[PDB]
Design a protein around this ligand. Sequence first.
Ligand SMILES: [Cl-]
Lengths: 305, 305
Amino acid sequence: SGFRKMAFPSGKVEGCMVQVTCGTTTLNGLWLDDVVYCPRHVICTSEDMLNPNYEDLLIRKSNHNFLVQAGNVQLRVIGHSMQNCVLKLKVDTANPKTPKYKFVRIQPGQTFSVLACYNGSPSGVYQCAMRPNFTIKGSFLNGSCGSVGFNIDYDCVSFCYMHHMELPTGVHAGTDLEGNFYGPFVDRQTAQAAGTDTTITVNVLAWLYAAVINGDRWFLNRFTTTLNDFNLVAMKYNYEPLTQDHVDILGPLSAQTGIAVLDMCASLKELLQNGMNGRTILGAALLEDEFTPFDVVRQCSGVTF
Amino acid sequence: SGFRKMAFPSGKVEGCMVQVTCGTTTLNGLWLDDVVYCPRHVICTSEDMLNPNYEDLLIRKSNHNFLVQAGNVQLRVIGHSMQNCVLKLKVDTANPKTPKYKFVRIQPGQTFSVLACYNGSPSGVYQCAMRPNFTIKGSFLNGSCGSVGFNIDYDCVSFCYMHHMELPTGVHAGTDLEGNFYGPFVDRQTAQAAGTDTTITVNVLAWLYAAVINGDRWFLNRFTTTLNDFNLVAMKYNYEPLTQDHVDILGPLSAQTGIAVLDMCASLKELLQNGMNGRTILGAALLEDEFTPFDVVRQCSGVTF
Ligand SMILES: [Cl-]
């Protein structure tokens, strides 16, 4: 019993983290087979970042200008290309610790684990989500660029996120592993501002299902609603619109607890309009939206890897 | 920038988790060198747990009654003893993945990472703390007994916690790695009730320091206080008494932000008496007490392992 913000075990990913230096700049890379992936801005000065021209900055560089360090030992770079906003450095050795893996582009509302790294060494693991405005609310100091977000299915690690930028807001932006940013962000130091951070409604409903499974039941109400009425009240609180696919995804949680999905929405409606009245739900005083419906099923049943 | 509940990378500990079976019961063990550690209740039936006599239950068992499985392959048990509430099974192979390690008994207020496991396989990693009443608020289903809590210092893993019991409250209890429970709990299914869960005051102050470092500054006040006055108000809210050693431990955070420790207490005093007024601090609406002062320093500076 009990419910915690839980991240995947990071062992499979620890053994893929390297340090990449290009002259004055150092960040982290992902070494999978004989390729090392890292943010293309490794090749910039701090001055270069107000208006960099990456194709021109790259002509100065040769295979040997990139120093890749895997723990203690150096890897030899034999080839380098730029793909969108990531650099792919071809090394001579395949990583002996390469797990089974996939590159996936996730969608807003999905969650993943971040292995935070500095100079190729893992510092910590935490769970976060792709906000609807395509930022993530992470924990990233300078030198952490190149840390990756991942999901593990049994034996296969699905890489979905590489860290690249911190917005002046203190929130973060990055790419998938083919180098395309999530959302409208770019790897330049300019006036980029994130949009409205709305709350991920399906995830909140998932987390309320987790609550009644685990004891907290005071918020269960005597009301029901419809999707259209609920969504009226959800727009006023900057909550994602709830859709019929979200309803289906919550079916298994609905089935396990005997609480129809629309009844739980009516419970959620009243928490938005009346507040928490100083009470708690799973030890929080605000509504948590960083568990997906699959996270709840997994943690409440014992799924391993 | 940003601040997250962060757990240590679990790689060093993943490679030590095994499955232990004793007839009908299966749980997890910790394989360090040529010893496997696990809760002694592996040897009980479900009926045995209302009133077990462990020394008598153990006479029935022989070296070969314990089945230890390390991923796929079986380990051969050549010796077994009971130490307080843990069993130590002597196997013929040393673990080739044994890291540098220590057994430590932590004190209330200290934090650590849990690697949750079922049938010897890691399911997830999260951070928690030893509450002042000597429980932990974990995430543990049946079969998770034997999961361990640990802290990593650079290369050395300090093991501090093994999971054993879930109280009827839904909170959890366990032992250090020499088998002694934290607090007054026992490995029997009886009416054991946890005491008042007080809030860890030094940890809250640490987390407010983390806030001003990261932007949230609305709660900074115009007042100061003294230890005795603050502790008067802390007792009424079931907050641990703040001591002069706690003041010293917070010195480095005091030095970095220019905010004297007692000024931050006066800020905390007003949050207890006036509430949050619907505002947030680092994205929470209640005060968080599961970061120690050393956690804050570490996450805000980039300490790796
Ligand atoms: Cl909260």
